[PDB]
């Protein structure tokens, strides 16, 4: 009951900043997540015995892939922790409970391949889920783990609170499908600008939580340049692997996934910052002003890619 998690001083301070990197010590990641739940939600939100069992089963169902791994799950949950802590009073008790879990679970049993690769390969999951294929799978794996004996961290929610929380987690996980991001942000843009944005409107909250999910999922672009750059190598290691598998099925992959076209990575990151990242954190900053540091860090990293291209690194 009175058993707090405490971190060393540097982590205890830096974990509160948007740009915190959880470090290379894997055995500290579970404790970092519990720390964030206890301050985001309270020491009462979950039974520690059950949360600890849930965390370790979720860890087990992330694979040893270069990018879409247990480290990303925890990184994405920390960005959400930063947003919730900088926006205390905008979020219900159930929302704070659901979103940290949604973030930890959002990429469960990822194999390092896109929805396109599953469809061109004709993977069973592409027949079971025609759109947001991996994301429907990740939500499904979440429900599985929640139903293992001793793993129901929501046991003490009422029947109806329970259904609300699994509904928050479902929409939050589905929204991590970047194919859905573009129109979600366009609608959030029109609503903010025409002044129709209304946080008491459930379908509006849903959109805003969805943009938060894209923001946390993409938060590698909001770290210190050396974290941003080194993470870019991990994400390209998956893409180039998928490119290799595209060629094995007899399909020229897009340049993004073609390891022969590595030269063009700096320009490809530029397009991505301009077309996805900057717009994402811009609309998030307009809706939730305290998330401006994510926009500011993203702009700094855009400038760092501009320098790579100009031969200054
Ligand atoms: C859109 N595009 C095009 C190219 C490219 C590269 C080389 C040759 C030709 C084209 N490359 C990107 C970018 C990919 C990409 C996609 C999703 C996330 C992400 N980041 C980087 C690391 O941390 C989190 C988000 N980057
Ligand atoms: Mg994903
Ligand atoms: Zn992800």
Describe this structure in words.
With about 325 residues, the protein is mainly α. It has a single domain, classed as Catalytic domain of cyclic nucleotide phosphodiesterase 4b2b (Orthogonal Bundle). The protein contains 14 helices and no strands. Zinc ion (ZN) binds next to helix 4. Its main location: cytoplasm. Keywords: Allosteric enzyme, cAMP, cAMP-binding, cGMP, cGMP-binding, Cytoplasm, Disease variant, Hydrolase, Metal-binding, Nucleotide-binding, Phosphoprotein, Repeat. GO terms for molecular function: 3',5'-cGMP-stimulated cyclic-nucleotide phosphodiesterase activity; 3',5'-cyclic-AMP phosphodiesterase activity; 3',5'-cyclic-GMP phosphodiesterase activity; 3',5'-cyclic-nucleotide phosphodiesterase activity; cAMP binding; cGMP binding; metal ion binding.
SSE layout:
Blueprint: H1 9-14, H2 29-40, H3 48-60, H4 70-85, H5 93-105, H6 115-121, H7 124-128, H8 133-146, H9 159-175, H10 178-194, H11 202-217, H12 225-248, H13 265-287, H14 292-309
Helix pairs in contact: 2-4, 4-5, 4-11, 5-9, 8-9, 9-11, 10-11, 10-13, 11-13, 13-14
Residues 107, 134, 176 line the site of magnesium ion.
Family: Belongs to the cyclic nucleotide phosphodiesterase family.
Binding site for a divalent metal cation 1: 72, 106-107, 217
GO biological process, one term: negative regulation of cGMP-mediated signaling
Task: Write a short abstract of this structure.
With 313 residues, the chain is mainly α.
Q: Tell me the span between the first and last alpha carbons.
A: 52 Å
Task: Classify the helix fraction into a percent range.
Answer: 55-70%
- N-to-C order of helices and strands: HHHHHHHHHHHHHH
β-sheet strand percentage: under 5%
Q: What is the general shape?
A: globular
Q: From the helix content, strand content and strand pairing, which structural class follows? A: mainly alpha
Oligomer: monomer
Q: How many beta-strand segments?
A: 0
Count of individual helical segments: 14
CATH class identity: Mainly Alpha
CATH topology: the name is Catalytic domain of cyclic nucleotide phosphodiesterase 4b2b
Q: State the CATH superfamily name.
A: 3'5'-cyclic nucleotide phosphodiesterase, catalytic domain
As for the number of domains, it is 1
| Main pleated sheet | none
Structural Rg: 19 Å
